[PDB]
Amino acid sequence: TTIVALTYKGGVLLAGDRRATQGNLIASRDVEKVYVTDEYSAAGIAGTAGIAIELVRLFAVELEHYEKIEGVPLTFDGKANRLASMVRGNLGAAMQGLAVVPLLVGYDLDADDESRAGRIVSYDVVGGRYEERAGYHAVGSGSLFAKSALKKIYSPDSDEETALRAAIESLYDAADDDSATGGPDLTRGIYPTAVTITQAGAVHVSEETTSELARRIVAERTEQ
Amino acid sequence: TTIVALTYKGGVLLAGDRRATQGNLIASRDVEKVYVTDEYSAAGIAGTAGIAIELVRLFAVELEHYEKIEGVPLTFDGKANRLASMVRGNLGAAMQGLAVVPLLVGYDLDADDESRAGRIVSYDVVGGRYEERAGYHAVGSGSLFAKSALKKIYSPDSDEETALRAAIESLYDAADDDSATGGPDLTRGIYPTAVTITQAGAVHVSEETTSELARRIVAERTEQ
Amino acid sequence: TTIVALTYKGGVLLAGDRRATQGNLIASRDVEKVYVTDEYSAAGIAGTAGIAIELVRLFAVELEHYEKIEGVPLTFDGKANRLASMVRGNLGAAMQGLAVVPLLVGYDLDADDESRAGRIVSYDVVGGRYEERAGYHAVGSGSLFAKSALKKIYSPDSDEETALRAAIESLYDAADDDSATGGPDLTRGIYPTAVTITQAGAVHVSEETTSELARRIVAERTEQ
Amino acid sequence: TTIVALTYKGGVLLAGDRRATQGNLIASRDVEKVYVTDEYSAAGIAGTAGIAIELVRLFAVELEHYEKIEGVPLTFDGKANRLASMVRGNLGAAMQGLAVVPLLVGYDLDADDESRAGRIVSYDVVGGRYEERAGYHAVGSGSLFAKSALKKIYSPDSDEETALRAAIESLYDAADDDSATGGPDLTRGIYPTAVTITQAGAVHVSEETTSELARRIVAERTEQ
Amino acid sequence: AEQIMRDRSELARKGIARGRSVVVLTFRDGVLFVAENPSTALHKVSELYDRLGFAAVGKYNEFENLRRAGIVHADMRGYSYDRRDVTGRSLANAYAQTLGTIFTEQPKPYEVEICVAEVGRVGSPKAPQLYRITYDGSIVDEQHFVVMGGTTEPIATAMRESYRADLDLEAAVGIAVNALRQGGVDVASLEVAVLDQSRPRRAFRRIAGTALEQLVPAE
Amino acid sequence: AEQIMRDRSELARKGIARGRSVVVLTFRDGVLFVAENPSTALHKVSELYDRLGFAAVGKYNEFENLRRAGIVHADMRGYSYDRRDVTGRSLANAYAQTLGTIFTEQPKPYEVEICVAEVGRVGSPKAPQLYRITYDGSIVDEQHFVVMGGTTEPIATAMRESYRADLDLEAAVGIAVNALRQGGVDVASLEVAVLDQSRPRRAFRRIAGTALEQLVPAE
Amino acid sequence: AEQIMRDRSELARKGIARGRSVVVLTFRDGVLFVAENPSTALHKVSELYDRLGFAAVGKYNEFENLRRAGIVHADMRGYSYDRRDVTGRSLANAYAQTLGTIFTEQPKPYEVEICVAEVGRVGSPKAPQLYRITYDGSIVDEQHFVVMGGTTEPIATAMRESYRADLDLEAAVGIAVNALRQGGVDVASLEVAVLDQSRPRRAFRRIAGTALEQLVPAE
Amino acid sequence: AEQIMRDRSELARKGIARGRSVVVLTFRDGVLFVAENPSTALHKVSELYDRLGFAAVGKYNEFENLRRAGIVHADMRGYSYDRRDVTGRSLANAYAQTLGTIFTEQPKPYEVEICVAEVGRVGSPKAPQLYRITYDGSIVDEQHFVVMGGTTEPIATAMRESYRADLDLEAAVGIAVNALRQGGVDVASLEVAVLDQSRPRRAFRRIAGTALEQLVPAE
Amino acid sequence: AEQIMRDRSELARKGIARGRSVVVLTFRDGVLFVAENPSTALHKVSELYDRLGFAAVGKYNEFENLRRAGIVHADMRGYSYDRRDVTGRSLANAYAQTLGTIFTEQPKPYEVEICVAEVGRVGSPKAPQLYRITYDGSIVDEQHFVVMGGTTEPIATAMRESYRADLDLEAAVGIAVNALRQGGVDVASLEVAVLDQSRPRRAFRRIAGTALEQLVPAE
């Protein structure tokens, strides 16, 4: 698995691959690993799909429950602290092999610099939370490759279109060196998914835009 | 064991073999592995028969109990989430060797495309649930072979008769390569069982139709 | 140990050997392994005699208690489900070497075909219950031999006298190949025990009938 | 240790050796292993003396407590079931090396054949109870030898004097082949103890009768 | 002491007499439920199990509570044993036990009256059975019909006279609808359902508008 | 203080005197139960154990509760020891203890009266025994007959005079049926059963219509 | 005994009649909430779930408590199953159960009245539904409008007459605002919100000042 | 406050004075129990331990309860230590503690009066001892005789005058039987037993009919 | 029933009216607290969190208790989430919930009245907010000033007239001090503090003698 997070002028984004493996065997070709957690935040998860998907689901519910009860949404930092609490509550399972690690992004409404309100927070298996602020970050088995690719192709304060392209490319490089990630499948028309968050909120990137971006990277590489 | 699920024009179906083994020894020749869980859903189970059969039985009861109390049946997704909860509650036993894994199918009354209301949901040992949407899926020791057979003989949006034939054939291929599955026994007149679900509900395929389909596949193969 | 169950025209029967061993040493020559559990049902038990005998005893009490409280006896299936529950409640002990496995038979008062109201239900160590419907079944260390003998000498829908004879013979074949079963002792006049259940209820076969049946099989075999 | 139980015309008896060993070392020469548990019953115990002696003591108290509360003594079978319960309650200790196994005898007041009201019940480490009805039985490290001796010198329905002699002799043979049993000590005047139960109740055999019986067996053997 | 139960009893009786009525009767196909209820969202009649039906009068939140308990009780017994071991008598006894305890220990008795109806199995020639449980734990078995809620006396006698065995569905409905008019309105605005014995497993079935139209006689 | 128990006692007494009656007596075959009960679904007489029978009057839900407890108690003792260790006296003492506690601690005493009947073992020449336990925990042993429910005095005296040892089944039934008529009806519409000592294990047996027909004398 | 509940009922009724009013009605877009409330910090109307709305009158701390419980209950059911399995009827029944228990066991009944409003799914042609639960556990389903708080009679009749199906948002607001004036003030100083069915998921939406300005008719 | 215990005390006193009587006395062989009891199934006298005897009057279910507790208590102490460490004084103190707590905390005091008798060991020349415990936890030690139940005064004085040390069994029985006649009948229909010190271990022994025949003097 | 709460309410009201007063108001720098309190060791005003202040009147031990609970509650929420998620409204609602439960379940209601004040963040142009919670769980939001303790009416009206927005610190103090004089003394012997919005994090600050000297106007 590989999930990447990128910061840009408008806000932040998350993109993830679609593969699931059971050892060497491929178990899924359309896994959704990025979820909108609320109006201004999204999260990606790596690890035991069983636990991960329902955990991020509960997170979303918890954020909306807070808002309906208090009449006010949580601070971005508050949302991050809550996720940490949930990760911490899974330490037991993690110690038995059922570990899960999320990557959180959001557009901080309480941020001073509105062009830099996009934030990235990574987590520990023990519940630790960390501000990234490098422009990008990644999690999962292929993260190592995605980060090294981004270290070269990423541009700070770029526009959305540029950031989205660098993201799908880093994921491409990840699937290129990590059989557990899996790149674009032009055969079935299945591509990485993504979410972008800005002043206007969190939106799901259309599969037409992902398809387009995938075809492009493939063509740039096929061209030797 | 091998249980297969197929999607078709009208709705969805489930078919499973009848064998039970204790190591290499054959312990049963007429195991029922597919159950109608309610008007528009059915489930097949692989694993420790002791636990599996009573678990799917409790599932059925739970679904009907919900309807009698609320006056309204659960959403298909709601039914799937409930099964997940039951699988999750067996993690303990699974970690001691008593694992069970179900395969759920249903005709989604709340589905938009009424010709594609048929759904297939597979599960994890940790309680995870997954939308299949490939047209078919399988579980059990012989699932590998059944899926590879289906990958070649399955036709999307086919009619019921065609889907039922491909199902019994995939199960035949499974018993052909997995001694733990067991094919048609023309000697005792015992064949795989099946359930079809459509706009009209879930129905048990007659053993006359299963017998007929079995005899056919056997004949096609016997004919070199 | 070997306990066999046979179906016939009138109803069903159970027969079991009398031996108990502690390793290679013989510990008992007159163990009672078949018990009438109520008017229309009986059960045989294999495994740790300590636990087994008192378990089947509690089962009997539970069945009669239900009837006195509700004024109506349980369904045969209900009786089987209750035994399953008790077996399941012994899983702990079984995992420590103190396992017990019963074989349940009964004349189903709610059965349609009154000539086939006789039923046989076998169990798991995890509490699973299984309908036999092959005409016969067996449990214990010598069950393998008894079943293979029955596969040749058993006649469906035979009369009581015939079924009883095949039963004692299958037990004879079991003691012939399994030192843990033990055949007829013409020296002390100790023979397998049996119970027959029909429209008239469950009855204990007289030791004069068992003696007679034993002497016969011995003579048929002694005659080379 | 060796404890033997014998049935005879009048009633039943129990006799046991006096030795206690800690490995090869002799730890006691006058252990009392047979106790009158009530008017018409007695019990012998083998195993961890610490637990055994106080257990049989509690048993006696429990029997008398029942009688004082209900105004009626328990059935012999009822007394046996109670002992079983106590043995079962020691399973934990037994699994850690502190096992104890009793041998119960009694004159059944509710017995039909008043000349055969004498009964012998042996036990399991798991609490199982078993009717002996062979005329005699034994428990402990030397039981194997005592039973094989009795198989030759025991006479069914003999008189008390004869039964007592066979008992002390079987114990003699036991001490002759099992260093953990220990025979008559003509040096210190210490001999096996015994209890006889008949229509008149349970009585302690005088040490003058035990002394006499011991001297006799010794003389018969010394006489080559 | 004896006055406490005296008052408790009156509070319940009055509360029930203040509400609408319900008629449950035995006919050709099994059991018929006819209850006065203007709402189509909140019910007073419901399925209990395969061959069991439930009907109540009184305070809603209280009998709705007992309705759910009954379903829980039935489903559980069926699971622990076999579906066929779930009997109407068993549930009736449970309600009696429950209501009796509430009438004695709770701060306020339940202003409720309940009826449990059972029909035989598909084949069985067994005649349907009805049970009635009251707020104080009293229970009686009726084999023809049961009337509860509001002023029963006039409705009861009416039924007592217009009742006949083996009644047609349309006839049975008339019998009940007319008997209901002897109280005190009573249009096609009431809750109706049946326990159809001809059905394989689940015998409970509700009768909607259009179908009810052609069953409720005019005045 | 002393008035509390005074009132509690009256509430129970009246409630019982308000109900129907039951007669339990000793005869040639063992024990006979004759109870006034129009229903055939809800009982007031029942088997307790192998040689024990149960009969009660008063509030149904309450004695039905005590009936079940008794069965639980008997089955359990038999299992912990031997079936033959289960005695009628033991159950009677348990009921006395239970009713006594309820009469003192519960919000309302149990409007109940109970009778436990025991017959000897198959062979035994032992004469049957009867015990009666009341709402306040009182208990008495009767060796001939017991009368409870409604207005007893007239029914008692009647029995007191028409009772004879070693009575025939038909005679015993008459004795009871006629004594029941001295109260206040009383047709072949009542609950009857016996504790037949001749039986091997389970001595309790009910006497159905047709068989009861030829036992209940006309008036 | 019967007087206790008599008084408890009055305490609640008076406390509610002493407070302000609220009007909930069905119109073209879904459901409209118009409540008299001078504060903009403390609410009486709130979102419950995707297609559910909440409105109450009476003692604040008490209905605010029930409001939170409702949100907890809805979120939990949605998570255990599917969001679409969360129904308005289910919550209404829960409130009824809860208030009923409080009215009977708690030291003081809740001086509250509650309304649960549900609108259909985006596509669905299903007509909105309203439920009203009172302090004693009573519950009724209304398909047009609900009035609660203060002196209702005058406001109810007003609505009863000025109500029409498929009302425009501006019209519906007028209907409610004018009906509110028939009580006893009533300026753009009140709490308003809607359950807009056209919305994809979360249908609840509040209507602020400027937007409310052009909806509340002058007097 | 002080009136509560006043009434509680009267309820118990009257209940006991309403019952029959019992006489316990010291003589040549140990201790004699003579109690008025028509029943042979339900006792008022019983063995406690090796050298201890129990006798009570009042409400049966209550003292039968205390009788069992006493046996439990004695058996347990004997097991924890040695049989010979079980003393009559120890049990008496326990009963006093228990009855005292019941009289103060329980809903109703125990209408009971109890006597614990102890005889010396086989050899010991120690004179028997008697203890009497009342419903309020009072306890006194008597070395000659104890009278309880019904109207004691007349029976007491009678004993007080006809008592002599080292009485013969036949004499002792007469002393008690005649003293019992000074109350208010009194035939060979009473419960009798002794604590025979000559016995090795269990000193308690009951005296049956035939043997009692030749001990109870005529009037 | 309704009288219980009637009395409970009076006990609290009187106890509060018997104590001194406090004035809380909104001005240019944020929020000002002026409370009558002769002691400098025991306070009635305190910091709650970063931008929250607390003030109470009534029985000390009781509001000091609620003061601590408030601090616990605030610190905890800030830790579970972020400091900035801690709102004045959230604490106010908690106090309302708490006091409401105490007024209904506790042996004695709390003779207390509480005010929670919140000022905006350093930059934010948001106007300060005030909440008042009473002994029965009532809660109101005030945006200008709050008066509580003793005889409020005269002090309230005074404030109502001498209040003006954007008041200077010295002016605001005068407004409060003079309004306090309209009650019934009132020298530089009172507790004063502010919630200074200009401060980075912790806005609460107390105003000592010397500084208070030059703020409290003479009479």
From Swiss-Prot, chains A, B, C, D:
Q: Which reaction does it catalyse?
A: Cleavage of peptide bonds with very broad specificity
The lineage's top-level taxon is: Bacteria
The record's principal subcellular location, in a coarse class, is cytoplasm
EC number in record: 3.4.25.1
Question: Could you tell me where this protein is found in the cell?
Answer: Cytoplasm
Keywords in alphabetical order: Autocatalytic cleavage, Cytoplasm, Hydrolase, Protease, Proteasome, Threonine protease, Zymogen
In which pathway does this enzyme or protein participate?
A: Protein degradation; proteasomal Pup-dependent pathway
What are the record's GO terms for cellular component? cytoplasm; proteasome core complex, beta-subunit complex
Q: Please list the residues that make up the active site.
A: 1 (nucleophile)
Activity regulation (UniProt): The formation of the proteasomal ATPase ARC-20S proteasome complex, likely via the docking of the C-termini of ARC into the intersubunit pockets in the alpha-rings, may trigger opening of the gate for substrate entry. Interconversion between the open-gate and close-gate conformations leads to a dynamic regulation of the 20S proteasome proteolysis activity.
Q: Which GO terms describe its molecular function?
A: endopeptidase activity; threonine-type endopeptidase activity
Q: List the GO biological process terms.
A: modification-dependent protein catabolic process; proteasomal protein catabolic process
Domain text from the record?
A: In contrast to M.tuberculosis, the propeptide is required for correct proteasome folding and assembly. The propeptide is positioned strategically at the region where it can act as an assembly-promoting factor by linking its own beta-subunit to two adjacent alpha-subunits at the same time.
Q: Which family does it belong to?
A: Belongs to the peptidase T1B family.
* Primary role: Component of the proteasome core, a large protease complex with broad specificity involved in protein degradation. The R.erythropolis proteasomes are able to cleave oligopeptides after Tyr, Phe and Leu, very poorly after Arg but not after Glu. Thus, displays chymotrypsin-like activity, low trypsin-like activity but no caspase-like activity.
Q: How does it assemble?
A: The 20S proteasome core is composed of 14 alpha and 14 beta subunits that assemble into four stacked heptameric rings, resulting in a barrel-shaped structure. The two inner rings, each composed of seven catalytic beta subunits, are sandwiched by two outer rings, each composed of seven alpha subunits. All four combinations of alpha- and beta-subunits (beta2-alpha1, beta2-alpha2, beta1-alpha2 and beta1-alpha1) yield fully assembled and proteolytically active proteasomes. The catalytic chamber with the active sites is on the inside of the barrel.
The protein's name: Proteasome subunit beta 1
Q: Which organism is it from?
A: Rhodococcus erythropolis (Arthrobacter picolinophilus)
UniProtKB/Swiss-Prot annotation, chains E, F, G, H, I:
Q: Does the keyword Cytoplasm apply?
A: yes
Its PTM note reads: The N-terminus is blocked.
Family matches, as PROSITE patterns:
PROTEASOME_ALPHA_2 (PS51475)
Q: Which CDD domains match?
A: Ntn_hydrolase
What GO annotations for molecular function exist for this entry? endopeptidase activity; threonine-type endopeptidase activity
- Coiled-coil regions in this chain? none
Q: What is its main location?
A: cytoplasm
| Pathway field | Protein degradation; proteasomal Pup-dependent pathway
Q: Where in the cell is it found?
A: Cytoplasm
Q: Name one Pfam family in it.
A: Proteasome
Q: Which NCBIfam families match?
A: 20S_bact_alpha (TIGR03691)
Q: Which family does it belong to?
A: Belongs to the peptidase T1A family.
Q: How does it assemble?
A: The 20S proteasome core is composed of 14 alpha and 14 beta subunits that assemble into four stacked heptameric rings, resulting in a barrel-shaped structure. The two inner rings, each composed of seven catalytic beta subunits, are sandwiched by two outer rings, each composed of seven alpha subunits. All four combinations of alpha- and beta-subunits (beta2-alpha1, beta2-alpha2, beta1-alpha2 and beta1-alpha1) yield fully assembled and proteolytically active proteasomes. The catalytic chamber with the active sites is on the inside of the barrel.
Protein name (database record): Proteasome subunit alpha 1
Report the source organism. Rhodococcus erythropolis
